[PDB]
Amino acid sequence: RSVRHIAIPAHRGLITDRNGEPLAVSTPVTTLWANPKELMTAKERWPQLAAALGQDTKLFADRIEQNAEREFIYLVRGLTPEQGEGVIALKVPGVYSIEEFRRFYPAGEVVAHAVGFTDVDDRGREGIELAFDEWLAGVPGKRQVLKDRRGRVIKDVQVTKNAKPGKTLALSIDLRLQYLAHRELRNALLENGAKAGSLVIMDVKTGEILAMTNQPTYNPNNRRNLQPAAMRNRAMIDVFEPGSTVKPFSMSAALASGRWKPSDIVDVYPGTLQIGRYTIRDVSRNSRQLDLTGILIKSSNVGISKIAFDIGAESIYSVMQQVGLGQDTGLGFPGERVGNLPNHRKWPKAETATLAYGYGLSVTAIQLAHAYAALANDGKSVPLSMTRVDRVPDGVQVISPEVASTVQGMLQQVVEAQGGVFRAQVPGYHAAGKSGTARKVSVGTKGYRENAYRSLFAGFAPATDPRIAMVVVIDEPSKAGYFGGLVSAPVFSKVMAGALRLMNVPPDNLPTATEQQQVN
Ligand SMILES: CCN1CCN(C(=O)N[C@@H](C(=O)N[C@H](C(=O)O)[C@H]2N[C@@H](C(=O)O)C(C)(C)S2)c2ccccc2)C(=O)C1=O
Ligand SMILES: [Cl-]
Ligand SMILES: [Cl-]
């Protein structure tokens, strides 16, 4: 006869989206345990008990007999509270129940990368569950139980320490936008036969991450055949060369230098530029000269390179650093990369050119979206947040309002002008942005791959008062082309349309507005 201590499970904190939609919830479950010593005196009830647990008669009997000398075994864990009381209703001697919790993720794969999961011991091992584990964790309680000589429980004596629940956490994510983004990125991956991808949506005024989705993904509620590669929150932890998607920042440096103005014309013939042993090449070569806007519309590597030689790498480096490329986001998401903005003491022409058109630096999709947000928010950068923001934070003017306005207009033309990225047009709205395509880095050697690509699009909308910024990255498309303006642009179009509608943003381009918007 003796008193034993028994744990009282604590409620882990609720994780919700920005509007209270549950993303991670501790749900009540019932574990059944048995005192084999008591069960051994009621052998005649076993077949009935075994059947009610869906276990084979002899296998169940073997279990109990092999543990006859023990005072405690688990019969089954994670029953619904109703099923547990169904078994306890049979009043089999030696069978007891205890209330426990199971962590459940109602959106499953849709937000697996951001939210993460807890392991068997209720510790966060990935994502937000890891990052806020101390905040979310409850502290389990304790109570005393009196047992007789045969381990039979005859009295609950007292609670020695109450359980304390963890705290609720509201993420910045809008689950509605997350569902839309998840579905459209998945469709694009499959249509394009791509290996992976990411999509980020950002509130340009508040810095809040409204959506963050990647492929491949996984179901955190059933991780039985989970492979490591599918667990990666690529938007935060994978870096890439952004290519021509950083040209707007090179252009901002030019415009801020005092040496360039939008009407200036750059000679780009014949669409290549030799600098020692290296050859800078333009993909499209149907122009001998281009104005500043045309350098972006036609995405001229040669054009931006000549501008970079004139203004110097330092001015470009400086803009990129200020908008957050290669810089710590301050988010503290587990595994998150800072990336790399190269800094030489002396900048050769080669490095100066490649920086300006987006190679030799590494960024994340989150950083790229953050930099576009600053541009969209009339040159004012606000800190990123993955938790709900109540008050608009004070921003930092990283690009002048005048320059940001001029670059916004250029990027609107990149989407809307003839020869532009027309697949990025958003019905009902004026949108602005820049596509990109990058050759992937060679496996097993230095240099770039001949037939493997990363497709990019980054932009914001609506042009008249930007509300959200979005980055789409698709890795190794193989079925319907590879250029960013063919692959990632239409994903931007569809997701931006949906997002703006879901957030009730009024259409600013009614000529192209669909029937449903022309009435509201
Ligand atoms: C540092 C050396 N090094 C590294 C590798 N490297 C590139 O991988 N270059 C890219 C490139 O130039 N892509 C263009 C861009 O984004 O501007 C295209 N993207 C299209 C689109 O987004 O639809 C477009 C607007 C129609 S043009 C390329 C070239 C050829 C085929 C695919 C991709 C360089 O250039 C380069 O010198
Ligand atoms: Cl490699
Ligand atoms: Cl290849």
Curated annotation (Swiss-Prot):
GO terms for molecular function: penicillin binding; peptidoglycan glycosyltransferase activity; serine-type D-Ala-D-Ala carboxypeptidase activity. It comes from the Bacteria. GO terms for biological process: cell wall organization; division septum assembly; FtsZ-dependent cytokinesis; peptidoglycan biosynthetic process; proteolysis; regulation of cell shape. It is a single-pass membrane protein. The active site is at 244 (acyl-ester intermediate). Its main location: membrane. Pfam families: PBP_dimer, Transpeptidase. Keywords: Carboxypeptidase, Cell cycle, Cell division, Cell inner membrane, Cell membrane, Cell shape, Cell wall biogenesis/degradation, Hydrolase, Membrane, Peptidoglycan synthesis, Protease, Septation, Transmembrane, Transmembrane helix. Residues 511-520 have a biased composition (Polar residues). Induction: Mainly produced during exponential phase of growth. Its EC number is 3.4.16.4. Pathway: Cell wall biogenesis; peptidoglycan biosynthesis. One of its GO terms (cellular component) is plasma membrane. It is an enzyme of class 3 (hydrolase). It is found in: Cell inner membrane. It catalyses: Preferential cleavage: (Ac)2-L-Lys-D-Ala-|-D-Ala. Also transpeptidation of peptidyl-alanyl moieties that are N-acyl substituents of D-alanine. Catalyzes cross-linking of the peptidoglycan cell wall at the division septum. Binds penicillin. Belongs to the transpeptidase family. FtsI subfamily. This is Peptidoglycan D,D-transpeptidase FtsI. It comes from Pseudomonas aeruginosa (strain ATCC 15692 / DSM 22644 / CIP 104116 / JCM 14847 / LMG 12228 / 1C / PRS 101 / PAO1).
